[PDB]
Each structure stands twice: as C-alpha cells, then as structure tokens.
C-alpha cells in the first residue's frame, strides 16, 4: 500500500577526543538497501540489496561524496553540542538523525520527516508542515534559530516532497519483485505444560513481509492482554519477519483461547485455537 | 538517494 524511504545516521564520539564513528543506513519500507560505515575499509556507500546494485558509478560516487559530507558535518556537530550542553570532553556522546518520506498507495507524497537526537533524546525536528521547527530544550534553540534564518526548511521541504519521492518511486520500480511483495505469515500454535496444572499457549507468525502485523488473544471472545506476552517483531535474517504471542492458561481451558492474526497478506484475518 | 546539501547544527 503505502511506502517509505528512510535514512538513519549515527555518529558516536569516543572519550579522549578521538574520531567518531559514523554509520549510515537506508531503508525502503522494511528493507535495507544501503550502508556507510566509517570503520569499514571501502569508505564508500555500499549496496545491501540486490536491486540497488544496478545503479552506476555516478550513483555510488555521488552517494559516497554526500555521505562523507554528512559524516563530516556530524563530527563538527558533536563538538558543537558539547559546547551547547556545557559538557566535558570526558564521555562518549551520540548524534542521531533520521529523514525520509512516505507515499500513499498512489505513490504521491504523504509525509516527510527530518529529525535529530542527542544522546538519545529529541534535539530538533522538522514539523509536519515542513516549514517550521520543534526543539524542546534551551540548548537546541540556537540551532533552530540558525536554521530558521538560513531557510534550511525550505530546502528540506523541496527534497522531501520532491526528490525523496522520486528516489522512492525509482527504488520501488527497480526493486519491485522484492519491495512490492507481500508475504503472508505462516502460523502455528504451540502448547507446553507449566507448573502442575497450567499451560503456555504460543501463537506464531513466521516468514512475513512487511513487518507490520497484529497478534491478539481472546478468551471466550474477549480480548485479553493480561498474562499475555508479546514479543517485538523480529527479523528472520532473510528479509522476512517473525512474531509470537503467548498466554498462560489453566489446563483444560485451552480451548477458550483464540489467537487472532492480522496482516496485509491475509485476505481475512486468521484465528487459531489449540486442539 | 540522500541529501545533496549539508548544514551544521
């Protein structure tokens, strides 16, 4: 249905004034397609999906030069932030940045994002109108004011509504077989005895794409989150995802409990029951 | 593709 392109950037300083590590990754939907790691040998943007490999040298050289400039910028930023927060050069600090765009089913722009965190906390973000900024702390106001005065948002807005979507469309087309697929979950339930008279029921969803999924338990048709365990959706390692949900029930009452699976690849939601 | 401009905070 809807699709996204996102880039994630992490710059990490080590104590002692050494040079930071910088990692960039790019995603289309739930599929990674490029990387840059400052630790690695190449010092180049690298492919991580088959459909991007066909891009030519001007791509790779261009993405490399831009990402190195991203890196260089963040190296400076880490220093600047230490100043803004009146921090010593004793610790390790982190800058994170994410930006990208969403499109609708019609592949038209829907939404854009451009935001930063410092040491794990929101620092500054472009608001949804792509014309204004949000910065919670005092320290970040300086940045907001610089960027406001230099009309940075206007330039980001043109990328996010424009260029970004164009790239996303290109990747969706070139990576159609991978990206435009839906893999419905393969499901099953397990049962193990617990204590003297209880049992764990576990509802499994495997080999699905995209990652968005809903698993829920009902007791006699009543939704239940109590005594329920839901794990984070996790990568299988092969481009699909996994998830499970479990409940602990008294033995003999297993058949009161139903697991409900919702996913885009499913014509109808699924119900599972232990027998 | 990524941004083709950069700016310091």
């Amino acid at each position, epitope marked *: 249905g809807s699709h996204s392109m996102r880039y994630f950037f992490t710059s990490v300083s080590r104590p002692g004034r050494g040079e930071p590590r910088f990692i960039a990754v790019g995603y289309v939907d739930d599929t990674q397609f490029v990387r840059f790691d400052s630790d690695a040998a190449s010092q180049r943007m690298e492919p991580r999906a088959p459909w991007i490999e066909q891009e030519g040298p001007e791509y790779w050289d261009g993405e490399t030069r831009k990402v*190195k*400039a991203h890196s260089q910028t963040h190296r400076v930023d880490l220093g*600047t932030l230490r*100043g803004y927060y009146n921090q010593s050069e004793a610790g390790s600090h982190t800058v994170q940045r994410m930006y990208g765009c969403d499109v609708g089913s019609d592949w038209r722009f829907l939404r854009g994002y451009h935001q930063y965190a410092y040491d794990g906390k929101d620092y500054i973000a472009l608001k949804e109108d792509l014309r204004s900024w949000t910065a919670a702390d005092m320290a970040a106001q300086t940045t907001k004011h610089k960027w406001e*005065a*230099a009309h940075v948002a206007e330039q980001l807005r*043109a990328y996010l509504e424009g260029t970004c979507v164009e790239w996303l469309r290109r990747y969706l087309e070139n990576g159609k077989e991978t990206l435009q697929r839906t893999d419905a979950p393969k499901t099953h339930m397990t049962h193990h005895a617990v204590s003297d008279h209880e049992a764990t029921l576990r509802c499994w969803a495997l080999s699905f794409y995209p990652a968005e999924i809903t698993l829920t338990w009902q007791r006699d048709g009543e939704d239940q989150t109590q005594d329920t365990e839901l794990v984070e959706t996790r990568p299988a390692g092969d481009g699909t995802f996994q998830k499970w949900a479990a409940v602990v029930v008294p033995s003999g009452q297993e058949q009161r409990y139903t697991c409900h699976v919702q996913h885009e690849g499913l014509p109808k939601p699924l119900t599972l029951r232990w027998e | 593709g990524i941004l*083709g*401009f950069v700016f*310091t905070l």
Partner: T-cell receptor
Amino acid sequence: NVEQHPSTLSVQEGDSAVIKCTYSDSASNYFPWYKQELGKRPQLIIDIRSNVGEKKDQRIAVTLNKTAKHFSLHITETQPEDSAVYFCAASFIIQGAQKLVFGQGTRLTINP
Amino acid sequence: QVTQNPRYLITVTGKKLTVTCSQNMNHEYMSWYRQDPGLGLRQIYYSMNVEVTDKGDVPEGYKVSRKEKRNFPLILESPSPNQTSLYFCASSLLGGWSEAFFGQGTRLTVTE
C-alpha cells in the same frame, strides 16, 4: 567551478546591467551576490535559493535556472553608485563541506 | 563586526607575519580568502567552529588557528612574493548558507 564573465562591463546611466554566472554542480542551492566598491570590502546585496526562480529587491533582482545551471544579477536603472566589482557565488559540497564558491568577479562601470 | 588588521602591510620575503581577524558576531564559521586580479575570491582556510580548521582551495604557505570563537589569525611562516595580495577574513552564521560578513581587507606586499 563557478564562472563569471565578462570581467568588465560598461553601461549607461539609467540603463540596465546584467551579470551572468554559470556553475557546475547541479546540487548547488544557494546563490548570493556580493558588491565591492573600490577600496572597500565585499558586501552581500542579494541572494536566491534553488527553490525560487526569481527574487527581487526593488531595482535589483536575481534570476536562476537550476536546470541549465546559470543565474544572473539584474540591475535596473543604474545609478553611479552601482559602479563596483560584483561577485557571484554558488554553494555546494566540496571536500566534505557546504561551501560558497566565488566567481571571478565583474567590474561594472556606470557611465554618464 | 568583523575586525581585520592591519589594513596595509609590507614584509620582506621570508619573515613570518600574522594577520589578525576578530569578530564579535556570535558566528561559529570563519574563513580566509585571497583576492587577486582575475581570480576572484579564493579560499585559504576555514573554520567551522572553535578548534576546527580545514584547508581551503589555496592553503599552501598559510596556517591558521582557532583557539577561540572570536579569533582566526592567518599565519604566513615564510612569506613569498606570490603571496602578495588582498586578504579578506569573513564570518558567517552558517557556512554555505548565509551572509558572509567580510573584514576590511589586508593589503600585503611581500618584497625582496
């Protein structure tokens, strides 16, 4: 590379002057013009960003074609005080930084 | 303002000199340029912030320092006749994006 020609231009008082710059990098996104009076320092007089095709400030304006990668300073109804060296710049990524790269300059003379 | 000194300078070849540049504008970015006939404004060195320095397009024969925000001196360890020029310091709120505020200029002649 940012190229600014001609090196010199003479225009009659009251007529218009146009100075054009070309640039190499299609990602360039900021284009300022600096005025330098004889013996004095350069000073920004007007600028434009790539999301805009023309920007004006009364008698003066800048026009941009980001596809063809050129832009121009327009000075209408020139006055004697418009006599100066004018420098254009384009901003783009060079050596890991967003940088203003200046053209070679154009010496404008407003003749009586 | 941006405060650049001296306005005029003579040195013999080989004798170390320093050109000063001070600003009290609440700007993190500073840079040095050389202005020569026909060549425009060429960047010598720039500094994105305190204790950060990076070469420009013509760094040879020059050094700088940025131990604090307000100052960005230009050092010529061994001045050469080909370093005879008009030097400009500039500062900016955001390099590559905003107005460059220039100093008054230093006119240096290196003599044999």
